[PDB]
CSV table of N, CA and C and ligand atoms in Angstrom, one decimal:
chain,number,residue,atom,x,y,z
A,202,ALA,N,91.6,59.6,-110.9
A,202,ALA,CA,90.6,58.6,-111.1
A,202,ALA,C,90.7,58.0,-112.6
A,203,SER,N,90.3,58.8,-113.5
A,203,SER,CA,90.4,58.3,-114.9
A,203,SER,C,91.9,58.0,-115.3
A,204,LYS,N,92.1,57.0,-116.0
A,204,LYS,CA,93.5,56.6,-116.5
A,204,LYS,C,93.7,57.4,-117.8
A,205,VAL,N,95.0,57.4,-118.1
A,205,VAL,CA,95.3,58.0,-119.5
A,205,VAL,C,94.8,57.4,-120.6
A,206,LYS,N,94.3,58.2,-121.7
A,206,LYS,CA,93.7,57.7,-122.8
A,206,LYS,C,94.2,58.5,-123.9
A,207,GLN,N,95.1,58.0,-124.8
A,207,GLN,CA,95.8,58.6,-125.9
A,207,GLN,C,95.7,57.6,-127.0
A,208,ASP,N,96.0,58.0,-128.3
A,208,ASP,CA,96.0,57.1,-129.4
A,208,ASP,C,97.0,56.2,-129.4
A,209,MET,N,96.7,55.0,-129.3
A,209,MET,CA,97.5,53.8,-129.2
A,209,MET,C,97.1,52.8,-130.1
A,210,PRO,N,98.0,51.8,-130.6
A,210,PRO,CA,97.4,50.7,-131.5
A,210,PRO,C,96.6,49.7,-130.6
A,211,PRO,N,95.6,49.0,-131.2
A,211,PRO,CA,95.0,48.0,-130.4
A,211,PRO,C,95.8,46.9,-129.8
A,212,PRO,N,95.3,46.2,-128.8
A,212,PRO,CA,96.1,45.1,-128.3
A,212,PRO,C,96.3,44.1,-129.3
A,213,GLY,N,97.6,43.5,-129.4
A,213,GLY,CA,98.0,42.5,-130.5
A,213,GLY,C,98.4,43.1,-131.7
A,214,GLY,N,98.4,44.3,-131.9
A,214,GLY,CA,98.7,45.1,-133.1
A,214,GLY,C,97.8,45.0,-134.1
A,215,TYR,N,98.2,45.7,-135.3
A,215,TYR,CA,97.4,45.9,-136.5
A,215,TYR,C,97.6,44.6,-137.4
A,216,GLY,N,96.8,44.5,-138.3
A,216,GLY,CA,96.9,43.3,-139.3
A,216,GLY,C,98.0,43.5,-140.2
A,217,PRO,N,98.7,42.5,-140.7
A,217,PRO,CA,99.9,42.5,-141.6
A,217,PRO,C,99.6,43.3,-142.8
A,218,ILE,N,100.5,44.2,-143.2
A,218,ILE,CA,100.5,45.1,-144.4
A,218,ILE,C,101.3,44.4,-145.6
A,219,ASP,N,100.8,44.4,-146.7
A,219,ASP,CA,101.3,43.9,-147.9
A,219,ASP,C,102.3,45.0,-148.5
A,220,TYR,N,103.5,44.6,-148.9
A,220,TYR,CA,104.4,45.6,-149.3
A,220,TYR,C,105.1,45.0,-150.6
A,221,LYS,N,105.2,43.7,-150.8
A,221,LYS,CA,106.0,43.2,-151.9
A,221,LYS,C,105.3,43.4,-153.1
A,222,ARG,N,106.1,43.6,-154.2
A,222,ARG,CA,105.6,43.8,-155.5
A,222,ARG,C,104.7,42.6,-156.0
A,223,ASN,N,103.7,42.9,-156.7
A,223,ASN,CA,102.7,41.9,-157.0
A,223,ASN,C,102.4,42.3,-158.5
A,224,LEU,N,103.2,41.5,-159.4
A,224,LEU,CA,103.0,41.6,-160.9
A,224,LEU,C,102.6,40.2,-161.4
A,225,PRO,N,101.4,39.8,-161.3
A,225,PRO,CA,101.2,38.3,-161.7
A,225,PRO,C,101.3,38.1,-163.3
A,226,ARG,N,101.6,37.0,-163.7
A,226,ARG,CA,101.8,36.5,-165.1
A,226,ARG,C,100.4,36.1,-165.5
A,227,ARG,N,99.8,36.6,-166.5
A,227,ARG,CA,98.5,36.2,-167.0
A,227,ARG,C,98.6,34.9,-167.5
A,228,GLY,N,99.5,34.6,-168.4
A,228,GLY,CA,99.8,33.2,-168.9
A,228,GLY,C,99.4,32.8,-170.3
A,229,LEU,N,100.3,32.9,-171.3
A,229,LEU,CA,100.0,32.4,-172.5
A,229,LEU,C,101.4,32.2,-173.2
A,230,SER,N,101.8,31.1,-173.7
A,230,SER,CA,103.1,30.9,-174.3
A,230,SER,C,103.3,31.8,-175.7
A,231,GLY,N,104.5,32.2,-176.0
A,231,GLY,CA,104.8,32.8,-177.3
A,231,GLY,C,104.5,31.7,-178.5
A,232,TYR,N,104.7,30.4,-178.3
A,232,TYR,CA,104.4,29.4,-179.3
A,232,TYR,C,103.0,29.4,-179.5
A,233,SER,N,102.0,29.5,-178.4
A,233,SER,CA,100.6,29.4,-178.6
A,233,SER,C,100.1,30.8,-179.2
A,234,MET,N,100.7,32.0,-178.9
A,234,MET,CA,100.2,33.2,-179.5
A,234,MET,C,100.6,33.2,-181.0
A,235,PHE,N,101.7,32.7,-181.4
A,235,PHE,CA,102.1,32.6,-182.8
A,235,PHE,C,101.1,31.4,-183.5
A,236,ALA,N,100.9,30.4,-182.8
A,236,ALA,CA,99.9,29.4,-183.5
A,236,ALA,C,98.6,30.0,-183.6
A,237,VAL,N,98.1,30.7,-182.7
A,237,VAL,CA,96.8,31.5,-182.9
A,237,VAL,C,96.8,32.3,-184.1
A,238,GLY,N,97.9,33.2,-184.3
A,238,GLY,CA,97.9,34.0,-185.3
A,238,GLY,C,98.0,33.3,-186.7
A,239,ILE,N,98.8,32.3,-186.7
A,239,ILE,CA,99.0,31.5,-188.1
A,239,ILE,C,97.6,30.9,-188.3
A,240,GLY,N,96.9,30.3,-187.4
A,240,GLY,CA,95.7,29.7,-187.6
A,240,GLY,C,94.7,30.7,-188.1
A,241,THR,N,94.4,31.9,-187.5
A,241,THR,CA,93.5,32.8,-188.0
A,241,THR,C,93.8,33.3,-189.4
A,242,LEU,N,95.3,33.5,-189.7
A,242,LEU,CA,95.6,33.8,-191.0
A,242,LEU,C,95.1,32.9,-192.0
A,243,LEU,N,95.4,31.5,-191.6
A,243,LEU,CA,95.1,30.4,-192.5
A,243,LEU,C,93.5,30.3,-192.9
A,244,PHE,N,92.6,30.5,-191.8
A,244,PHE,CA,91.2,30.4,-191.9
A,244,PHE,C,90.8,31.6,-192.8
A,245,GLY,N,91.3,32.8,-192.6
A,245,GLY,CA,91.0,34.0,-193.4
A,245,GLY,C,91.5,33.7,-195.0
A,246,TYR,N,92.7,33.0,-195.1
A,246,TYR,CA,93.1,32.7,-196.5
A,246,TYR,C,92.2,31.8,-197.2
A,247,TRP,N,91.6,30.7,-196.5
A,247,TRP,CA,90.8,29.9,-197.1
A,247,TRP,C,89.4,30.4,-197.4
A,248,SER,N,88.9,31.2,-196.5
A,248,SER,CA,87.6,31.8,-196.7
A,248,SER,C,87.7,32.8,-197.9
A,249,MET,N,88.8,33.5,-198.1
A,249,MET,CA,88.8,34.5,-199.2
A,249,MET,C,89.2,33.8,-200.4
A,250,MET,N,89.8,32.5,-200.4
A,250,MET,CA,90.0,31.8,-201.5
A,250,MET,C,88.6,31.3,-202.1
A,251,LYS,N,87.7,30.9,-201.3
A,251,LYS,CA,86.4,30.5,-201.7
A,251,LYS,C,85.7,31.6,-202.3
A,252,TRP,N,85.8,32.7,-201.5
A,252,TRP,CA,84.9,33.9,-201.9
A,252,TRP,C,85.4,34.6,-203.3
A,253,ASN,N,86.8,34.5,-203.5
A,253,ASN,CA,87.3,35.2,-204.7
A,253,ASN,C,87.0,34.3,-205.9
A,254,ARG,N,87.0,33.0,-205.6
A,254,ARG,CA,86.6,32.1,-206.8
A,254,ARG,C,85.2,32.3,-207.2
A,255,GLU,N,84.3,32.4,-206.3
A,255,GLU,CA,83.0,32.7,-206.6
A,255,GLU,C,82.7,34.0,-207.2
A,256,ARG,N,83.5,35.0,-206.8
A,256,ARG,CA,83.5,36.3,-207.5
A,256,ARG,C,84.1,36.2,-208.9
A,257,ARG,N,85.1,35.4,-209.2
A,257,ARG,CA,85.5,35.3,-210.5
A,257,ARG,C,84.4,34.6,-211.5
A,258,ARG,N,83.7,33.7,-210.9
A,258,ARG,CA,82.5,33.1,-211.6
A,258,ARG,C,81.5,34.0,-211.9
A,259,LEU,N,81.1,35.0,-210.9
A,259,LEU,CA,80.1,35.9,-211.1
A,259,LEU,C,80.5,36.9,-212.1
A,260,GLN,N,81.7,37.3,-212.1
A,260,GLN,CA,82.2,38.4,-213.1
A,260,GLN,C,82.1,37.7,-214.6
A,261,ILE,N,82.5,36.4,-214.7
A,261,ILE,CA,82.5,35.7,-215.9
A,261,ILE,C,81.0,35.6,-216.4
A,262,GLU,N,80.1,35.3,-215.5
A,262,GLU,CA,78.6,35.4,-216.0
A,262,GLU,C,78.2,36.8,-216.5
A,263,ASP,N,78.6,37.8,-215.8
A,263,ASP,CA,78.3,39.2,-216.3
A,263,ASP,C,78.8,39.4,-217.6
A,264,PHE,N,80.1,38.9,-217.8
A,264,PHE,CA,80.8,39.1,-219.2
A,264,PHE,C,80.0,38.4,-220.1
A,265,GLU,N,79.5,37.1,-219.9
A,265,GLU,CA,78.8,36.3,-220.8
A,265,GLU,C,77.5,37.0,-221.3
A,266,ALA,N,76.8,37.8,-220.2
A,266,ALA,CA,75.6,38.4,-220.6
A,266,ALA,C,75.9,39.7,-221.5
A,267,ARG,N,77.0,40.4,-221.1
A,267,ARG,CA,77.4,41.5,-222.0
A,267,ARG,C,77.7,41.0,-223.4
A,268,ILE,N,78.4,39.9,-223.6
A,268,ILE,CA,78.7,39.4,-224.9
A,268,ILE,C,77.6,39.1,-225.6
A,269,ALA,N,76.6,38.4,-224.9
A,269,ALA,CA,75.3,38.1,-225.6
A,269,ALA,C,74.5,39.3,-226.1
A,270,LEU,N,74.6,40.5,-225.2
A,270,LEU,CA,73.8,41.7,-225.6
A,270,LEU,C,74.6,42.5,-226.8
A,271,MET,N,75.9,42.2,-226.9
A,271,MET,CA,76.7,43.2,-227.7
A,271,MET,C,76.2,43.5,-229.2
A,272,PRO,N,75.9,42.4,-230.1
A,272,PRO,CA,75.5,42.6,-231.3
A,272,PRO,C,74.4,43.6,-231.6
B,223,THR,N,120.9,45.7,-144.5
B,223,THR,CA,120.6,44.8,-145.6
B,223,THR,C,120.1,45.6,-146.8
B,224,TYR,N,120.4,45.0,-148.0
B,224,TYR,CA,120.1,45.8,-149.3
B,224,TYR,C,119.5,44.8,-150.2
B,225,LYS,N,118.9,45.4,-151.2
B,225,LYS,CA,118.3,44.5,-152.2
B,225,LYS,C,118.9,45.1,-153.7
B,226,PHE,N,118.7,44.1,-154.6
B,226,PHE,CA,119.0,44.4,-156.1
B,226,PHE,C,117.8,44.6,-156.8
B,227,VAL,N,117.7,45.7,-157.6
B,227,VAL,CA,116.5,46.0,-158.3
B,227,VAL,C,116.6,45.5,-159.8
B,228,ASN,N,117.6,45.5,-160.4
B,228,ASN,CA,118.0,45.2,-161.7
B,228,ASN,C,119.1,44.2,-161.8
B,229,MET,N,119.1,43.3,-161.1
B,229,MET,CA,120.3,42.2,-161.2
B,229,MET,C,119.7,40.9,-161.5
B,230,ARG,N,118.8,40.9,-162.7
B,230,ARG,CA,118.3,39.7,-163.1
B,230,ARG,C,118.9,39.4,-164.6
B,231,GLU,N,119.0,38.0,-164.9
B,231,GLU,CA,119.6,37.7,-166.2
B,231,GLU,C,118.6,36.9,-167.0
B,232,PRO,N,118.2,37.5,-168.2
B,232,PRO,CA,117.1,36.7,-169.0
B,232,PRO,C,117.8,35.3,-169.5
B,233,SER,N,116.9,34.3,-169.4
B,233,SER,CA,117.2,33.1,-169.9
B,233,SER,C,117.4,33.1,-171.5
B,234,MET,N,118.4,32.2,-171.9
B,234,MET,CA,118.7,32.2,-173.3
B,234,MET,C,118.4,30.9,-173.9
B,235,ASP,N,117.4,30.1,-173.4
B,235,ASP,CA,116.9,29.0,-174.1
B,235,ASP,C,115.9,29.3,-175.2
B,236,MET,N,115.5,28.3,-175.9
B,236,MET,CA,114.6,28.7,-177.1
B,236,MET,C,113.3,29.2,-176.7
B,237,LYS,N,112.6,28.6,-175.6
B,237,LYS,CA,111.5,29.1,-175.3
B,237,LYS,C,111.3,30.4,-174.7
B,238,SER,N,112.4,30.9,-173.9
B,238,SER,CA,112.3,32.2,-173.4
B,238,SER,C,112.6,33.2,-174.5
B,239,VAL,N,113.4,32.9,-175.5
B,239,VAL,CA,113.9,33.8,-176.6
B,239,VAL,C,112.5,33.8,-177.5
B,240,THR,N,111.9,32.8,-177.7
B,240,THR,CA,110.6,33.0,-178.4
B,240,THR,C,109.6,33.6,-177.8
B,241,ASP,N,109.5,33.6,-176.4
B,241,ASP,CA,108.6,34.5,-175.7
B,241,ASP,C,108.9,35.9,-175.7
B,242,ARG,N,110.2,36.2,-175.6
B,242,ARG,CA,110.5,37.7,-175.9
B,242,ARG,C,110.3,38.2,-177.3
B,243,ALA,N,110.4,37.3,-178.2
B,243,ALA,CA,110.2,37.7,-179.6
B,243,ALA,C,108.7,38.1,-179.8
B,244,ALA,N,107.8,37.1,-179.3
B,244,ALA,CA,106.4,37.2,-179.2
B,244,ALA,C,106.1,38.6,-178.6
B,245,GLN,N,106.5,38.8,-177.5
B,245,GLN,CA,106.4,40.2,-176.8
B,245,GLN,C,106.7,41.2,-177.7
B,246,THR,N,107.9,41.2,-178.4
B,246,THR,CA,108.4,42.4,-179.0
B,246,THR,C,107.4,42.5,-180.3
B,247,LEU,N,106.9,41.4,-181.0
B,247,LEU,CA,106.2,41.5,-182.3
B,247,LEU,C,104.7,41.7,-182.1
B,248,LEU,N,104.1,41.2,-180.9
B,248,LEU,CA,102.6,41.1,-180.7
B,248,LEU,C,102.1,42.3,-179.6
B,249,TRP,N,103.3,42.9,-179.1
B,249,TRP,CA,102.9,44.0,-178.0
B,249,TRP,C,102.1,43.6,-176.9
B,250,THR,N,102.6,42.7,-176.2
B,250,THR,CA,101.8,42.0,-175.1
B,250,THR,C,101.7,43.0,-173.9
B,251,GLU,N,102.8,43.6,-173.5
B,251,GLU,CA,102.8,44.5,-172.4
B,251,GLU,C,102.1,45.8,-172.6
B,252,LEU,N,102.1,46.2,-173.8
B,252,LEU,CA,101.2,47.3,-174.2
B,252,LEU,C,99.7,46.9,-174.1
B,253,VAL,N,99.4,45.8,-174.4
B,253,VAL,CA,98.0,45.3,-174.2
B,253,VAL,C,97.7,45.2,-172.7
B,254,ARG,N,98.7,44.8,-171.8
B,254,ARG,CA,98.5,44.8,-170.4
B,254,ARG,C,98.2,46.2,-169.9
B,255,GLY,N,99.0,47.2,-170.3
B,255,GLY,CA,98.8,48.6,-169.9
B,255,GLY,C,97.4,49.0,-170.3
B,256,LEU,N,97.0,48.6,-171.6
B,256,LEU,CA,95.7,49.0,-172.1
B,256,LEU,C,94.6,48.4,-171.2
B,257,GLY,N,94.7,47.1,-170.7
B,257,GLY,CA,93.8,46.5,-170.0
B,257,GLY,C,93.7,47.1,-168.5
B,258,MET,N,94.9,47.5,-168.0
B,258,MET,CA,95.0,48.2,-166.7
B,258,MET,C,94.1,49.5,-166.8
B,259,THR,N,94.4,50.3,-167.8
B,259,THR,CA,93.5,51.5,-168.0
B,259,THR,C,92.0,51.3,-168.2
B,260,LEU,N,91.7,50.3,-169.1
B,260,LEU,CA,90.3,49.9,-169.3
B,260,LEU,C,89.5,49.5,-168.0
B,261,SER,N,90.2,48.6,-167.2
B,261,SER,CA,89.7,48.3,-166.0
B,261,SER,C,89.6,49.4,-165.0
B,262,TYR,N,90.5,50.5,-165.1
B,262,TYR,CA,90.4,51.5,-164.2
B,262,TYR,C,89.4,52.5,-164.5
B,263,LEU,N,89.0,52.5,-165.8
B,263,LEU,CA,87.8,53.3,-166.3
B,263,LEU,C,86.6,52.9,-165.6
B,264,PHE,N,86.2,51.6,-165.5
B,264,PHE,CA,85.0,51.2,-164.9
B,264,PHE,C,84.7,51.2,-163.5
B,265,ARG,N,85.6,52.0,-162.7
B,265,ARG,CA,85.4,52.0,-161.4
B,265,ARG,C,84.9,53.6,-161.0
B,266,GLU,N,84.4,53.7,-159.9
B,266,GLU,CA,83.9,54.9,-159.6
B,266,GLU,C,84.8,56.1,-159.3
B,267,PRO,N,84.6,57.2,-159.9
B,267,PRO,CA,85.6,58.3,-159.7
B,267,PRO,C,85.7,58.8,-158.3
B,268,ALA,N,86.7,59.6,-158.1
B,268,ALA,CA,86.9,60.1,-156.6
B,268,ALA,C,86.5,61.6,-156.5
B,269,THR,N,85.8,62.1,-157.6
B,269,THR,CA,85.5,63.6,-157.7
B,269,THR,C,84.3,63.8,-156.6
B,270,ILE,N,84.3,64.9,-155.9
B,270,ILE,CA,83.3,65.4,-155.1
B,270,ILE,C,82.6,66.5,-155.8
B,271,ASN,N,81.3,66.8,-155.5
B,271,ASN,CA,80.5,67.8,-156.3
B,271,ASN,C,80.6,69.2,-155.3
B,272,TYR,N,81.7,69.8,-155.4
B,272,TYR,CA,81.9,71.1,-155.0
B,272,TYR,C,81.1,72.2,-155.8
B,273,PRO,N,80.4,73.1,-155.2
B,273,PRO,CA,80.5,73.5,-153.7
B,273,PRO,C,79.4,72.9,-152.9
B,274,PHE,N,78.6,72.0,-153.7
B,274,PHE,CA,77.6,71.3,-152.7
B,274,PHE,C,78.1,70.2,-151.9
B,275,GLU,N,79.3,69.7,-152.2
B,275,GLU,CA,80.0,68.8,-151.2
B,275,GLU,C,81.5,69.5,-150.9
B,276,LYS,N,81.8,69.2,-149.6
B,276,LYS,CA,83.1,69.8,-149.2
B,276,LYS,C,84.1,68.8,-148.6
B,277,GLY,N,85.4,69.1,-148.8
B,277,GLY,CA,86.4,68.2,-148.4
B,277,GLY,C,86.3,68.0,-146.9
B,278,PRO,N,86.9,66.9,-146.4
B,278,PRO,CA,86.9,66.8,-144.9
B,278,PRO,C,88.0,67.8,-144.3
B,279,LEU,N,87.6,68.1,-143.0
B,279,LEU,CA,88.5,69.0,-142.2
B,279,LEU,C,88.7,68.4,-140.9
B,280,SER,N,89.2,69.2,-140.0
B,280,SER,CA,89.7,68.9,-138.7
B,280,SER,C,89.5,70.0,-137.7
B,281,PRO,N,89.2,69.7,-136.5
B,281,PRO,CA,89.0,70.9,-135.6
B,281,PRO,C,90.3,71.7,-135.4
C,370,PEE,C1,101.9,30.7,-192.8
C,370,PEE,C2,102.0,31.9,-193.6
C,370,PEE,C3,102.0,33.2,-192.8
C,370,PEE,C4,103.0,34.2,-193.4
C,370,PEE,C5,103.8,34.8,-192.2
C,370,PEE,C6,103.0,36.0,-191.3
C,370,PEE,C7,103.3,35.8,-189.9
C,370,PEE,C8,103.4,37.1,-189.2
C,370,PEE,C9,104.3,37.2,-188.0
C,370,PEE,C10,104.8,38.5,-187.7
C,370,PEE,C11,103.6,39.6,-187.7
C,370,PEE,C12,103.8,40.9,-186.6
C,370,PEE,C13,103.9,42.2,-187.2
C,370,PEE,C14,103.3,43.2,-186.4
C,370,PEE,C15,104.0,44.5,-186.3
C,370,PEE,C16,105.3,44.3,-185.5
C,370,PEE,C17,106.2,45.5,-185.6
C,370,PEE,C18,107.2,45.6,-184.3
C,370,PEE,O1,107.2,44.6,-183.6
C,370,PEE,O2,107.8,46.7,-184.0
C,370,PEE,C19,108.0,46.9,-182.6
C,370,PEE,C20,107.5,48.4,-182.3
C,370,PEE,O3,106.2,48.3,-182.0
C,370,PEE,C21,105.7,49.4,-181.1
C,370,PEE,O4,106.4,49.8,-180.3
C,370,PEE,C22,104.3,50.0,-181.5
C,370,PEE,C23,103.8,50.7,-180.2
C,370,PEE,C24,103.0,52.0,-180.4
C,370,PEE,C25,101.8,52.2,-179.5
C,370,PEE,C26,100.6,51.6,-179.9
C,370,PEE,C27,99.9,50.8,-178.8
C,370,PEE,C28,99.6,49.3,-179.2
C,370,PEE,C29,98.2,48.8,-178.9
C,370,PEE,C30,97.1,49.4,-179.7
C,370,PEE,C31,96.2,48.4,-180.3
C,370,PEE,C32,96.7,47.9,-181.6
C,370,PEE,C33,95.4,47.4,-182.6
C,370,PEE,C34,95.9,46.7,-183.9
C,370,PEE,C35,94.7,46.5,-184.6
C,370,PEE,C36,94.2,47.7,-185.4
C,370,PEE,C37,93.0,47.3,-186.4
C,370,PEE,C38,92.8,48.4,-187.3
C,370,PEE,C39,109.4,46.9,-182.4
C,370,PEE,O5,109.9,47.9,-181.7
C,370,PEE,P1,110.9,47.5,-180.4
C,370,PEE,O6,110.3,46.6,-179.5
C,370,PEE,O7,111.2,48.9,-179.6
C,370,PEE,O8,112.5,47.1,-180.8
C,370,PEE,C40,112.9,47.6,-181.7
C,370,PEE,C41,114.6,47.6,-181.5
C,370,PEE,N1,115.2,46.4,-182.1
């Protein structure tokens, strides 16, 4: 009466299975990376230029006050 | 049929050499591995709460 019933794949088979290596390239050129590094270095250099000159002026002002108080 | 696993030849043009030098100096693949680990932290763990939860079995 009852037909055979055992573990079999479904009709038409299973869905395709991926096996190829998948290592995508994120994407950024070495020239671009070096340019970003140089640009951030230059920006830091300029900002610290300005801040260090201001610090020199502040130190000179403190020295002026000390000179005034010295006698 | 057979495949080659390590039979690639790196390009010797200026752009490729600069790319490899940028990789050497800025540690790009190390950052890629760090990113893989960081992403893998933010996913749910596979640990079950034994003995309150039990591993699957079969008849
Ligand atoms: C216009 C004026 C500008 C003046 C010029 C300035 C330009 C600067 C350009 C170059 C700067 C790059 C220097 C940075 C250090 C590079 C050193 C280096 O590349 O050494 C590596 C080695 O580097 C390493 O392997 C270190 C890896 C150690 C593991 C650490 C993981 C790295 C990721 C952690 C995050 C780093 C965070 C950095 C910021 C910290 C902030 C406190 C070479 O080794 P190999 O590739 O094996 O080749 C040698 C055989 N010939």
